[PDB]
Amino acid sequence: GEVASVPLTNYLDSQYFGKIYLGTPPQEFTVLFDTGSSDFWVPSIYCKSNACKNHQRFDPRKSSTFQNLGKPLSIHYGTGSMQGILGYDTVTVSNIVDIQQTVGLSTQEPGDVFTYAEFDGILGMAYPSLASEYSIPVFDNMMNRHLVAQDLFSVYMDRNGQESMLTLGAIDPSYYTGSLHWVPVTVQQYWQFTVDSVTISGVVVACEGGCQAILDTGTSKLVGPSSDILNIQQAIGATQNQYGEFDIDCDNLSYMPTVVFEINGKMYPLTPSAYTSQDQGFCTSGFQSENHSQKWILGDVFIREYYSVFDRANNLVGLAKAI
Amino acid sequence: XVVXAX
Ligand code: NA
């Protein structure tokens, strides 16, 4: 099998996406490679939603390899949703050619989440148990057909440029320092594991007694249960403005605390610079509440600090300090 | 932001 490097483009530190090619001849799309879902879909000619109007739409009639499947697709995300119809076609991801791959063609993309997204579609990278009926995840096909060198992939999110990278089938040591640390997956659906505590200077501020978290490339922020998140916002000095936005005084950055996630026996600090979005002197919090869920989401805020490896052979997540 | 599946 082979290793494939898939360069990722960063849009506003909030979404990281790459190019795939679908059909014969290839129709090009940008997709968010999403470790928090398992379905692969792109917009199509059958969608008249606003989001479909300002993105690339797949035309199955122009593809000689397209085979319709007939089955419906419906996906709800934390932000946004889609309906569509499943089919089969060849998708190429870097140097890996994935024939007869199930792919959703959108018919509805309601609301503006996807209207204002830079990517066209989503390529999910989680477990088959999270996939819709009749939908086989792309990476599972790649493993089952022996197209990749190893049953793992790795994600680097560049803090200081556009060198972000998804590596299929390998880890790249140029993206981290120190040692890789392995964390067992608890529930095989999302890339989920146990966090033992969240502390500031040895004092527990959140996740008292342990909690579940997922590692999700497709979530921009660090999301947690609302009461725990509110405790963190208070500790770091993030204050809600009249519009509901949690603002941070930029001049406090060198005088603010580090928030530490204890994960399988190793500490994962987030410095003020790591958790604070800094926009030309205007600063906001990278922590976000979720309504009633209690499952944490370690999104791009976290992954920028920790090079992330997703190992399907052994059901592990790997973390290392990013370069 | 986005928060990607239910
Ligand atoms: Na294992």
∠ CA A48-A52-A53, rounded to 5°: 80
Q: Which tokens hold the place of A215?
A: 């590692």
Q: Whole-angstrom Cα distance, residue A216 to residue A222?
A: 9
Where do the domains of chain A lie, and which CATH numbers do they carry? 3-171 (2.40.70.10), 172-323 (2.40.70.10)
Whole-angstrom CA distances from A54 to A44, A51, A78, A99, A191 are 12, 6, 22, 28, 32
Question: Is A13 part of the annotated catalytic residue set?
Answer: no
Closest CA to A71 of A86, A88, A81, A83: A86
Strands of A216-322, DSSP E: 222-225, 239-240, 246-248, 259-263, 266-270, 276-279, 282-285, 287-290, 296-298, 306-311, 316-322
Q: How was this structure determined?
A: X-ray
Bridge partners of A15? A11
Gap between the Cα atoms of A269 and A272, Å rounded: 10
Give resolution, Å, one decimal. Answer: 1.6
Instruction: Check CB contact under 8 Å for B4 and A217.
Output: yes
The Cα–Cα gap between A312 and A316 comes to 7
Helix (H, G, I), strand (E, B) or coil at A72: strand
Distances (CA, A) of A253 to A141, A272, A274, A279, A280: 46, 6, 10, 13, 14
CA distance A155 to A33: 10
Helix (H, G, I), strand (E, B) or coil at A141: helix
Chain B residue nearest residue A119, CA to CA:
B2
What is the number of other CB atoms lying within 10 angstroms of the CB of residue A111? Answer: 13
Q: Specify whether the CB–CB gap between A91 and A147 falls below 8 A.
A: no
Torsion of CA A181, A187, A191, A197, to 10 degrees: -60
The residue among A179, A76, A92, A176 whose CA lies nearest residue A130 is A76
H-helix or E-strand containing A16? Answer: strand A15-22
Which positions in chain B touch A37 (Cβ < 8 Å)?
Answer: 4-5
Between the CA of A264 and the centroid of ligand 1 the distance, in Å, is 14
Amino acid (1-letter code) at residue A75: I
Do the beta carbons of residue A98 and residue A90 sit within 8 Å? Answer: yes
Q: Which of A239, A237, A222 is nearest to A289 (CA)?
A: A222
CB A152 within 8 A of CB A171: yes
